[PDB]
Amino acid sequence: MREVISIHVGQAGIQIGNACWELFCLEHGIQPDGQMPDAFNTFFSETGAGKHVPRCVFLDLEPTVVDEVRTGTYRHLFHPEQLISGKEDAANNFARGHYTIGKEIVDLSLDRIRKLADNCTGLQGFLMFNAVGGGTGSGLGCLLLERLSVDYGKKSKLNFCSWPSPQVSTAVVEPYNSVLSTHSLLEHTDVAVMLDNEAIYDICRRNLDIERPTYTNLNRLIAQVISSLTASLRFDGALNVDVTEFQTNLVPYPRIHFMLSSYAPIISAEKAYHEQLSVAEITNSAFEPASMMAKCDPRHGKYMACCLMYRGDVVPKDVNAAVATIKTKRTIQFVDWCPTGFKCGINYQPPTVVPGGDLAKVMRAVCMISNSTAIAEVFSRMDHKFDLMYAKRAFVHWYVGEGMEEGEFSEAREDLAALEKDYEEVGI
Amino acid sequence: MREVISIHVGQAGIQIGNACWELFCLEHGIQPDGQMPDAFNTFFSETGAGKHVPRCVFLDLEPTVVDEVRTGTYRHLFHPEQLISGKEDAANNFARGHYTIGKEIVDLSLDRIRKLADNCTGLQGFLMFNAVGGGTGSGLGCLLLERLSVDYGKKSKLNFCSWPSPQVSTAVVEPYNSVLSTHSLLEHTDVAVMLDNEAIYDICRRNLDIERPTYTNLNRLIAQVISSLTASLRFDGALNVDVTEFQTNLVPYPRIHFMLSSYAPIISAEKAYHEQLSVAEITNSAFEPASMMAKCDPRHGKYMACCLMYRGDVVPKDVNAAVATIKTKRTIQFVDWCPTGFKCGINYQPPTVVPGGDLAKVMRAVCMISNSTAIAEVFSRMDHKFDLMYAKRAFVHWYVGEGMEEGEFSEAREDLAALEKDYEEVGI
Amino acid sequence: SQPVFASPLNVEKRRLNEERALMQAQKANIQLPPNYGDMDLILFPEGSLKNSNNTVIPQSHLKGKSVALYFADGADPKCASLLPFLLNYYRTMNEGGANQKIEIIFVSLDRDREAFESHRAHMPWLSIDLENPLTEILKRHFRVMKEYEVPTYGYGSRTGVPSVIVIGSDGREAQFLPICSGLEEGDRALLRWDWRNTKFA
Amino acid sequence: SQPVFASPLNVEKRRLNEERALMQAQKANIQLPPNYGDMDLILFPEGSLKNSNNTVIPQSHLKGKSVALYFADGADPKCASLLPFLLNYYRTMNEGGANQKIEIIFVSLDRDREAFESHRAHMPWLSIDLENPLTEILKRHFRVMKEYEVPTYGYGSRTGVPSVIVIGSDGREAQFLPICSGLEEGDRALLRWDWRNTKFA
Amino acid sequence: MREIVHVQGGQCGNQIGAKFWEVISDEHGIDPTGTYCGDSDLQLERINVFYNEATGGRFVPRAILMDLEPGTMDSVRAGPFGQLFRPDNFVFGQTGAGNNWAKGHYTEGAELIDSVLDVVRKEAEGCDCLQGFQITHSLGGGTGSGMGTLLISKVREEYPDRIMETFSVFPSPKVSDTVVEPYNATLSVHQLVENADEVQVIDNEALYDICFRTLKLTTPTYGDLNHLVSAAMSGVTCCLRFPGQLNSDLRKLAVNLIPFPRLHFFLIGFAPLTSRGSQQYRALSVPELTQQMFDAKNMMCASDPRHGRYLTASAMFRGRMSTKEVDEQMLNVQNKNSSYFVEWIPNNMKSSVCDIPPKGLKMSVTFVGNSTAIQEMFKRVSDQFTAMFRRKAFLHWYTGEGMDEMEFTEAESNMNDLVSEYQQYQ
Amino acid sequence: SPPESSLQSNFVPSHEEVGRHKRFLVNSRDSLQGNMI
Numbered sequence A, B: 001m002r003e004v005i006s007i008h009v010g011q012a013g014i015q016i017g018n019a020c021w022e023l024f025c026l027e028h029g030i031q032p033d034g035q036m037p038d039a040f041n042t043f044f045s046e047t048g049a050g051k052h053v054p055r056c057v058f059l060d061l062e063p064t065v066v067d068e069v070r071t072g073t074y075r076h077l078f079h080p081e082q083l084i085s086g087k088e089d090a091a092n093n094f095a096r097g098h099y100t101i102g103k104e105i106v107d108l109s110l111d112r113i114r115k116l117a118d119n120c121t122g123l124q125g126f127l128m129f130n131a132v133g134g135g136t137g138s139g140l141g142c143l144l145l146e147r148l149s150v151d152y153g154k155k156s157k158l159n160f161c162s163w164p165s166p167q168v169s170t171a172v173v174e175p176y177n178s179v180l181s182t183h184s185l186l187e188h189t190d191v192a193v194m195l196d197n198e199a200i201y202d203i204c205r206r207n208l209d210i211e212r213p214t215y216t217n218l219n220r221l222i223a224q225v226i227s228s229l230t231a232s233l234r235f236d237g238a239l240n241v242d243v244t245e246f247q248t249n250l251v252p253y254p255r256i257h258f259m260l261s262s263y264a265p266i267i268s269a270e271k272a273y274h275e276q277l278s279v280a281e282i283t284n285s286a287f288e289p290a291s292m293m294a295k296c297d298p299r300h301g302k303y304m305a306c307c308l309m310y311r312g313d314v315v316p317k318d319v320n321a322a323v324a325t326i327k328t329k330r331t332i333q334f335v336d337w338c339p340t341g342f343k344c345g346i347n348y349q350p351p352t353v354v355p356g357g358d359l360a361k362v363m364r365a366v367c368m369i370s371n372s373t374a375i376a377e378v379f380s381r382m383d384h385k386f387d388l389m390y391a392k393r394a395f396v397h398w399y400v401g402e403g404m405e406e407g408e409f410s411e412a413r414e415d416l417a418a419l420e421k422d423y424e425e426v427g428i
Numbered sequence C, D: 001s002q003p004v005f006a007s008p009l010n011v012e013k014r015r016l017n018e019e020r021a022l023m024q025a026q027k028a029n030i031q032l033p034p035n036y037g038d039m040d041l042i043l044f045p046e047g048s049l050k051n052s053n054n055t056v057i058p059q060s061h062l063k064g065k066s067v068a069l070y071f072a073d074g075a076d077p078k079c080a081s082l083l084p085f086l087l088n089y090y091r092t093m094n095e096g097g098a099n100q101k102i103e104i105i106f107v108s109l110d111r112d113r114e115a116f117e118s119h120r121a122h123m124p125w126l127s128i129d130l131e132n133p134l135t136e137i138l139k140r141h142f143r144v145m146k147e148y149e150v151p152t153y154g155y156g157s158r159t160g161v162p163s164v165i166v167i168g169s170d171g172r173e174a175q176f177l178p179i180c181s182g183l184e185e186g187d188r189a190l191l192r193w194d195w196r197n198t199k200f201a
Numbered sequence E: 001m002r003e004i005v006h007v008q009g010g011q012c013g014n015q016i017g018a019k020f021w022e023v024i025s026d027e028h029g030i031d032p033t034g035t036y037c038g039d040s041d042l043q044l045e046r047i048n049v050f051y052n053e054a055t056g057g058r059f060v061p062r063a064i065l066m067d068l069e070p071g072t073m074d075s076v077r078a079g080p081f082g083q084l085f086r087p088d089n090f091v092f093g094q095t096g097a098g099n100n101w102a103k104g105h106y107t108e109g110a111e112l113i114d115s116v117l118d119v120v121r122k123e124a125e126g127c128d129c130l131q132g133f134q135i136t137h138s139l140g141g142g143t144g145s146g147m148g149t150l151l152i153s154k155v156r157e158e159y160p161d162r163i164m165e166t167f168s169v170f171p172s173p174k175v176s177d178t179v180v181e182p183y184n185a186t187l188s189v190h191q192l193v194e195n196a197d198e199v200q201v202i203d204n205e206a207l208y209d210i211c212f213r214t215l216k217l218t219t220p221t222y223g224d225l226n227h228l229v230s231a232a233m234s235g236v237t238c239c240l241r242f243p244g245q246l247n248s249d250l251r252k253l254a255v256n257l258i259p260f261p262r263l264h265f266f267l268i269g270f271a272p273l274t275s276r277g278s279q280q281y282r283a284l285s286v287p288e289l290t291q292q293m294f295d296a297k298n299m300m301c302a303s304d305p306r307h308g309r310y311l312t313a314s315a316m317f318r319g320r321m322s323t324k325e326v327d328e329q330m331l332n333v334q335n336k337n338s339s340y341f342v343e344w345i346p347n348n349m350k351s352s353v354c355d356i357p358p359k360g361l362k363m364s365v366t367f368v369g370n371s372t373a374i375q376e377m378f379k380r381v382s383d384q385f386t387a388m389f390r391r392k393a394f395l396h397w398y399t400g401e402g403m404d405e406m407e408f409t410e411a412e413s414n415m416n417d418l419v420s421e422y423q424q425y426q
Numbered sequence F: 001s002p003p004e005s006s007l008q009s010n011f012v013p014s015h016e017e018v019g020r021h022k023r024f025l026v027n028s029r030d031s032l033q034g035n036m037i
């Protein structure tokens, strides 16, 4: 009846799928073999005698991260052909990752995305977790989004794209890969959400106070984001928010579909039992500019939509009371054509803390996804970094001789500047 | 409902604050874990299982006194970022407090104050404790008051700053640090109450006959003073005294708010077994110049206003008989334009004795705070030993070469000289 | 069976606990071999624990306390650094309260007899002696090895000495305090021992 | 757990209270471990306290007292300087009234038996013989040390010999008399001995 | 947290540095094999102030050993507490400066500069930031003075705002070996007057006097004098390493004691100092701790402070104490010795309290003091320098290694200005 | 379970709220027309 299909590409997508399904297995009672000792129907499918089976595809052209998953603890949970492996790495190359080396794996991926979404009608939507700075995260992510758009055009296309930070970029050709990826992220992706690494790096550094955090702790925080995302879809609540509600309440123009994210409270056991984490004390920290998960400073931007989702034993009395003081403070500001900007969802079931992680057992939590004019800044320094290094033909021969042509860079430059002219056109 | 925020800047603020909050924990019944084996609300917050966390911030630029509180007994009472710490000491410098180190710690400091104030409406004010002779207690203590006036405008701000002695000062550049702190707190502090260390040493030597106590024994006696000021805020009584008439009864003019204090009885167990403790004689002890709290002789000072805070089993009848005795008494002279001179407040709760301390279990006490013209002499001795050392450019290169320019000394000099003229004009 | 399958404590846990399952099945539909959460063992025998006054306490005294093991070695410089701050965190945690909160049981990675009494004279919490086989089956269960001399069954060393392991009544790995791990949070990892939640019950 | 967590008389406490609290647990929602207020010890057993001319003097002889514990050494000149001062104070305090008010329990740091009898003969109050383990289970409890020789669990040097320690019913440090402490003030701190609040109940 | 970086130059600096780390590790309970013993929290809560962990739990001092002749490096390593240092911080010279400033500063000291600045940057930049530098060297010889003060200059265009402790030993007044003393002493002084944040001097005949009349040693060796100096070493810095009722540090000391940046010279001292049999005979309390402290014999300098006038002063304190009577006796000594203190600074005294005494003691005191009496002992260096200068003696050793005549004339003119500005403050 | 109804059929609240008190210490007083003890 009701189901949602997650799609992960790249090494970053694979381990971001490992965190969000270490969590979803831990809350639904799913052992690593799938045996329970009807709310599971979105992420797990009933197969045989009490076994619940993952609803995804794991995609990576290099085997080095995916075949170590199929030798792991979650190896009798996952179907073998949902984890699809290539033979060679895309190697930070949009030309190979889209044209040359990524064409013999799409025919298996579209076979499995058909075999997974045809078991029941009323599919709720597709989620996408791609690495923008990666090779197969940008190249293979672009082409299969293109093929799922021609096949299933009238279904939701969520995306949590992990963007390179202004200073943390861990490679050299992130100007080419990200600008080429956002040419098609603009055109056939219904929802885009930026997950910048350094922003979540800082959040673990001061809130959870881990000054040697690793990609594991980065991945748990995204798992909490997607858990309180689809909490209203899986469990009941005082006020439901559907995935269809997202685009109708956060996207006023089809070109502008790039929003933000924030999770609060992210307190640590030690700091946990020390604050009454109330439906307000936690929604003020959710709107704090430094609590951002993509380091887009919103004090020089105008909020154009915001969606808040509460998760726990939340009364809506102080939901409305705390969101009023959000509306009255002048350090926040809304663009005048949206006098209201707030869509609320309420889920009764509290979030579940993972043992040995870095959060604590918190009764109530907030996840907030806001569209703003302050997306123009993450693309504005993207303009600076791309032109500064495209100027004298750096790394161009890895793209020209490997499938694309000289001029794809000019139009990918042009339509991002068209996105900037469109964003400042909203910004009056 | 009611709540008051305590701010402690400098390690003088730290050591006064740890003994101030250990009395509050023993006054309401808070174990060193912050549990109660309802007046806690006006000093201790709540977060579920009795967790009555404190509502106080602890500023220090050096860590050597803050993190040893974290190592010590009171770990889990205090919220860990309520204890806020830097790395390097200001080291007796106004410029080091303001422009080089304090600009990086004040952003996190007001971040914690804002979160700790917006928890519930009913904030009576801020209780400031600092050292004017120090570097962070005077420099960073200034810049906190600058940022508190710009946002929290109409809120009350009490002050208890440790003025240095004519003799015991344990520094040489406290002539610079103190009179630059005056240029802060004539126009930012609402009510300034004066303190002095030898004026607590001579009380410990005479009134308790304790020949070798330390800094921590000073901190119990002042903790009893602040607990007596907030006696009516928390406990019930015949005459309620909250913070709003510490200023409208004691401050006749906006530039006249520097004022004195006194505490009585300060009597050990071996002297309380012979002396009867009547309300008439405990207030007679509070009027003696030798029992004063900041070493300011009131024979040449002329009492403009006074406040008495009776705490314990004090019947209002002998309140009024004792206060009529001091009007008959000639050596305590009052002002002709303020014929009435007294605000009285009765609270039924007896003073709480600390075991292992210096005081005994007395059934009644007085906390007297008197605004008098005698505060002219504590700044006139500041006049004499400032101009005696400023005249030959001693210790000036540290200040001028570290951000602050020459000439701010001269206008703060003209500021306290204007304070001298104001006190002489009102005292006619 | 958790966190490991190849440990002497847990293979003796399995052997004992489906032993009486066959016995009650022959006495009596029962599901054999029994499930992991249905499995209940004894973790410390009658004469194993030993407090500072050299008298013995059974395991029943620790119920309602957040107990944690402590693997330490006398000659190791890291262990001599963790020992004072572990003593201070064991001190100020319980003094500042009205209820015993945490408890520490000491497991030894020390060479011989006379060196153990010198190290054991410094801590005020519980301890287990070397010649007891319970120490051998404990660090082969939580995989606390300073070096690979005992053949470990496909794993690696889970953590290096010193380490504190928050345990449960079923030998559960409740939380790991990261002293020598991927976080490598020396001297401060202690400020993360959730005294609540984890409660040997 | 007052005043020392690592006290050995206090771990001898805990072994007994949640022994029998486990017994009402199994005979019958009882809080284990029991709260710090509700443990009840027995401090001086039947054969521990001796009076003058060496007859048995039990613990029931101490209600309504202000009882303090006099750690002493025979050849320590600090104890020699203070002993005649406390003889005069113990005379006038305990005779000049309508009730037998104060009481001193002597605890010894002497070298041998001959040193014990010589110093005992100049003290009229109660005393504890050195061969009892009470003199060592109480010396570490109230943190009294001659030099740093007994292995301690991270204590401090609270006081040197001599020391008078006013106590309570449950071994709680009632109030310290600072003859040799952070106050450093000599042979007059015994006058600080209040007796109304520090009643042995 | 804060880390001070230690630099030892000359053969004097090698063996005062070895005794320094022997006393600091004695205070911190550190085995010479690198481990820690003592089972105490309050030692190990400040280790990064002086040491670094080495992923085995062992602590390496953040000290740099510096000489152009490996004979003194061999003696440091072979002795006790010589297996504490890393061998990489020992920088080796193979030629050796034969008591020549030009040999250790310009010609053969220069090739070891670039091999030791990267050693300084190894832990100064190896941390997030450092509290300051602490150099201790010799001025009687060449490899301590020329190599040491050139290191002082080259670390200040890199760390200009950072503090500069310098513990420089000075030539003998009475019985001096190393017959070319005054040239090396003066060439140090006019260079360090503009690039040392605070200089605090040591004289060996003062340490001989301390070992003679207030300690009664019949045969004090050089290690006995080194233990006296090392006690003042731990005294000036232990307020960072341990808490107290009134905390201070080295930046506390510099801002409180330097009214004018051209004057930063100090006397050093340490009390209590008792003999063998008099340790049990003498009371240990803060009246007599200060009364012994402000005496001519207690100082580690060849200067009588009663001839001069105490311009600014500071005594830190250690151990179980009490807070008025530490202070009001600084009031007492300011009120009896009203002619021994300057009048145009009110309350010339800095007092700070640390709650931890040194090992074996229960209270102690370490006094530094900007006295103008030190001018008396720049004069005896200066007039013995100009007595040998007009003779035109032994400058062929100096100008034969690339040094101009006019730098020597700048040495005399700068120290003449140094004594002239100290004189008018009397 | 959703949160339960807090109103009866009589249309009145179901559970009280304890008011924020002030730590009431009593005062013993009575006089006039007999004026007690």
Ligand SMILES: Nc1nc2c(ncn2[C@@H]2O[C@H](COP(=O)(O)OP(=O)(O)OP(=O)(O)O)[C@@H](O)[C@H]2O)c(=O)[nH]1
Residues within 6 Å of the ligand: A009, A010, A011, A012, A013, A015, A016, A060, A062, A089, A090, A091, A092, A093, A131, A132, A133, A134, A135, A136, A137, A138, A162, A163, A164, A169, A170, A171, A195, A197, A215, A216, A218, A219
């Ligand atoms: N949010 C998040 N991003 C990650 C994580 N790990 C890697 N990334 C991103 O992934 C990018 C690099 O691409 P990879 O994921 O390592 O590799 P790929 O996606 O398979 O593509 P290739 O580079 O061709 O191998 C980096 O720029 C990171 O931004 C992670 O744990 N969390």
Ligand SMILES: Nc1nc2c(ncn2[C@@H]2O[C@H](COP(=O)(O)OP(=O)(O)OP(=O)(O)O)[C@@H](O)[C@H]2O)c(=O)[nH]1
Residues within 6 Å of the ligand: B009, B010, B011, B012, B013, B015, B016, B061, B089, B090, B091, B092, B093, B130, B131, B132, B133, B134, B135, B136, B137, B138, B162, B163, B164, B168, B169, B170, B171, B197, B215, B216, B218, B219, E245, E246, E247
């Ligand atoms: N009454 C009292 N006064 C103190 C205490 N601690 C310091 N002081 C006063 O503060 C003065 C020294 O300045 P500090 O407070 O230590 O320094 P600070 O204000 O923290 O600023 P910094 O110098 O940068 O550390 C002394 O002269 C004392 O008068 C204390 O615990 N109690």
Ligand SMILES: Nc1nc2c(ncn2[C@@H]2O[C@H](COP(=O)(O)OP(=O)(O)O)[C@@H](O)[C@H]2O)c(=O)[nH]1
Residues within 6 Å of the ligand: E010, E011, E012, E015, E016, E097, E098, E099, E100, E138, E140, E141, E142, E143, E144, E145, E169, E171, E172, E176, E177, E178, E202, E204, E222, E223, E225, E226
């Ligand atoms: N303070 C101190 N001075 C010393 C010590 N040993 C030697 N000296 C002095 O240093 C001078 C010797 O200089 P030296 O270091 O050998 O010359 P250099 O090797 O070229 O630096 C003599 O005048 C000694 O008085 C010591 O251990 N401590």
Ligand SMILES: [Mg+2]
Residues within 6 Å of the ligand: A010, A011, A090, A131, A133, A134, A135, A136, A137, A138, A139
């Ligand atoms: Mg990729």
Ligand SMILES: [Mg+2]
Residues within 6 Å of the ligand: B089, B090, B091, B092, B093, B096, B134, B135, B136
């Ligand atoms: Mg300062």
